[PDB]
Design a protein around this ligand. Structure first.
Ligand SMILES: COc1ccccc1[C@@H](NS(=O)(=O)c1cc2ccc(=O)[nH]c2cc1Cl)C(=O)N(CC(=O)O)Cc1cccs1
Lengths: 10, 697
């Protein structure tokens, strides 16, 4: 189960 | 007021980077009070809600964000991550592909998309998408470390040293900034990281479980302080997502039924549903109690059931592997919790009291590598159900086609009865090995293999082609059943040379590194009449390995590749090799047990990590100290001696052949009694109240 990246919207 | 909500949204992003998730959630919601239609706050909030395991509430906000802005690329990508964690891979792909449609240069989305291809087995596409993300965002720890593992999987050693430098550089920076490292704990064993970095990597992945259990607000459990409620029996809970057709069951499926019911009450907690295999069937029937926790998704309720069963020792058999629900252990429903068998390394976490190992695998001087206390087994912590699963391999017979012991091999439950029906069976005293001459019967078996026939009958006995076990009895092929026919295994089935030494390694390719292949190349150059036997896992790694072997001067025909075979065929065809060359970077723990059961010597060079010392531990228990190398030069010398001194090879092969039975390596009955003695040491220690201490003795 490869991890993912969440995006922080500014 | 979108301006004030924007300030709150940026502040929440900052708190989010610092690990203050609770405050980030409070700030995102406050921004949604000041600006209800804040699509960015909805998405950012859903991300942290996902970190806390509140996936259904996260999806609700992701969709609320996309109702506001139908072209919100960040929302689709983030929502894709929540759908993937929810096992909805098609839904994640549609989200990822929609995000990249809106923003072609969305680095995160390409990396997230690459994760699906990686988990799917489409490594070349994962590499392509990870490189795209790094091309758009060269500073991308997640995309770089997962790309590094993709290259490890396919044995692409392109700029390996520099790649390792940057990996270690990325982890050190992440550990310094108190960010979750991008290298997985299971994969850390493969990279030149310090033992401190490996434990730190584990420690921070173990802390993730708290984020998912803190929102549960559960109080600590009251644990039993005696065995009166369980009629003087110690209640042991085995937690595993692998009660079925999985290597772990292939190792310990007999242990539950072999526990002494006078002193122990065994509880098996499945984190996975029933897959319909006999492995699952066996454990469910032989355990005193079988609890399918896959039906209880909530860790709070699931943890309650464990505590409400009165468990004294809870055993973690997953570590940081697929299917693990370590949140159950973070809640500590049992007074004593121990790692065992499933995971080759430290949890790095607080809740795990012990790790079940041995003096060889985890000598006391390396206690700093583990967060848990060392609990030593008498000989080796490892174990396999080979004696119960593959009894037909306890004896063998060969065909003198000219006397080799691994060119044409016959195995079977009715082998002696079949040999007794032949008038010209000879014996070679070693248990001695019977030899069938090159008679009419011998030509008939050879004809079947060459002609590719499935099986023949001789004197009423069925003789099965080893390559066609699935067409004969699929249960036999998976190890669920014992094959009831006499099976024929020949080097000719796999293109192996009839008159050359065969060094084998059926480990997964990612365990090989440039130094390891260089050792094997040195061994092949020193033993001219030899070849290397490797597994096609993944198949796209075959050309990669060849090229490097080609650079080192070995022709392409010196390295023979075979496809992945059913369990029974994998363990049975190990009889065709002369020696097994273990991988020093990460030992093949289950693979070593399979090779040892086949009577094949294994050469190993124990490192410092637990994963690199299991092979040495197995041989130490088997009683073959001459196969353990202290450095690379001794590793090569030991291998070259087995391939050129055929008298020494015969002696070492007979040693493994005999001691696999006479030594405790495969004796599950003895292993269970020794494990029970260790369990009681832990409880006796707990009865006094002492904190978990080393059981090295
Ligand atoms: C960590 O292992 C895992 C983890 C999760 C899921 C399954 C496995 C693994 N199970 S195993 O160890 O009992 C096994 C090994 C070999 C090796 C050579 C061969 O020719 N046939 C084999 C058949 C078997 Cl059942 C597996 O099936 N595979 C095969 C596949 O997934 O296609 C992967 C391998 C493990 C070790 C060497 S290959």
């Amino acid at each position: 189960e490869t991890g993912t990246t969440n995006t922080a919207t500014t | 007021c979108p301006t004030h909500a924007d300030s709150l949204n940026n502040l929440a992003n900052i708190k989010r980077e610092q690990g203050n998730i609770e405050e980030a959630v409070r700030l995102y919601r406050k921004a949604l009070e000041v600006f209800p239609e804040f699509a960015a706050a909805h998405s950012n909030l859903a991300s942290v809600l996902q970190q806390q395991g509140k996936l259904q509430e996260a999806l609700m906000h992701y969709k609320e964000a996309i109702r506001i802005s139908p072209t919100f690329a960040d929302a689709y990508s983030n929502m894709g991550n929540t759908l993937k964690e929810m096992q909805d891979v098609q839904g994640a792909l549609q989200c990822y592909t929609r995000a990249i449609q809106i923003n072609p240069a969305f680095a995160d989305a390409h990396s997230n998309l690459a994760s699906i291809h990686k988990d799917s087995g489409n490594i070349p596409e994962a590499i392509a998408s990870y490189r795209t993300a790094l091309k758009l965002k060269p500073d991308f720890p997640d995309a770089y470390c997962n790309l590094a593992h993709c290259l490890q999987i396919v044995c692409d050693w392109t700029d390996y040293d520099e790649r390792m430098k940057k990996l270690v550089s990325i982890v050190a920076d992440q550990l310094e900034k108190n960010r979750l490292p991008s290298v997985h704990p299971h994969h850390s064993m493969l990279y030149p990281l310090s033992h401190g970095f490996r434990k730190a990597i584990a420690e921070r992945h173990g802390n993730l479980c708290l984020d998912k259990i803190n929102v549960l607000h559960k109080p600590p459990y009251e644990h039993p302080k005696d065995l009166k409620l369980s009629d003087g029996r110690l209640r042991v809970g085995y937690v595993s997502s692998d009660f079925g057709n999985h290597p772990t069951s292939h190792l310990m499926q007999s242990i539950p039924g072999m526990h002494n019911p006078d002193k122990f009450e065994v509880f098996c907690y499945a984190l996975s549903p029933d897959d319909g295999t006999n492995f699952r069937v066996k454990v469910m029937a032989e355990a005193n109690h079988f609890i399918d926790l896959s039906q209880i998704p909530c860790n709070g309720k699931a943890a309650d059931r464990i505590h409400q069963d009165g468990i004294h020792i809870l055993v973690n058999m997953n570590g940081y592997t697929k299917g693990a629900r370590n949140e159950l252990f973070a809640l500590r429903p049992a007074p004593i919790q121990a790692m065992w068998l499933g995971y080759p390394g430290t949890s790095g976490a607080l809740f795990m009291d012990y790790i079940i190992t041995d003096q060889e695998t985890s000598p006391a001087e390396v206690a700093e590598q583990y967060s848990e206390k060392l609990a030593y087994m008498p000989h080796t912590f490892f174990i396999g159900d080979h004696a119960n699963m593959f009894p037909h391999l306890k004896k063998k017979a060969v065909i003198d086609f000219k006397i080799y012991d691994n060119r044409i091999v016959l195995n079977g439950i009715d082998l002696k009865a079949f040999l007794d029906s032949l008038p010209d069976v000879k014996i070679v005293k070693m248990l001695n090995m019977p030899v069938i001459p090159m008679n009419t019967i011998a030509e008939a078996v050879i004809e079947m293999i060459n002609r590719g026939q499935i099986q023949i009958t001789i004197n009423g006995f069925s003789i099965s082609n080893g390559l066609a076990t699935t067409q004969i009895n699929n249960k036999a092929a998976t190890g669920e059943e014992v094959p009831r026919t006499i099976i024929v295994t020949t080097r000719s089935q796999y293109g192996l040379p009839e008159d050359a030494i065969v060094y084998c390694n059926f480990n997964q390719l990612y365990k090989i590194d440039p130094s390891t292949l260089q050792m094997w190349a040195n061994i092949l150059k020193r033993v001219p009449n030899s070849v290397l036997w490797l597994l096609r896992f993944p198949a796209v790694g075959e050309p990669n390995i060849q090229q490097y072997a080609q650079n080192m001067g070995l022709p392409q025909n010196r390295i023979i590749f075979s496809p992945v075979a059913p369990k029974e065929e994998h363990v049975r065809r190990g009889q065709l090799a002369d020696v097994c060359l273990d991988t020093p970077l990460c030992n093949g723990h289950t693979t070593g047990m399979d090779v040892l059961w086949a009577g094949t010597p294994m050469v190993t060079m124990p490192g410092e990590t637990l994963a690199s010392r299991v092979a040495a531990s197995q041989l130490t228990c088997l009683g073959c100290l001459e196969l353990i190398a202290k450095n690379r030069q001794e590793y090569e010398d030991i291998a070259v001696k087995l391939g050129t001194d055929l008298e020494y090879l015969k002696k070492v092969r007979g040693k493994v052949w005999k001691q696999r039975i006479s030594s405790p390596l495969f004796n599950t009955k003895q292993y269970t009694m020794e494990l029970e003695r260790l369990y009681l040491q832990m409880w006796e220690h707990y009865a006094a109240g002492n904190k978990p201490d080393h059981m090295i003795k």
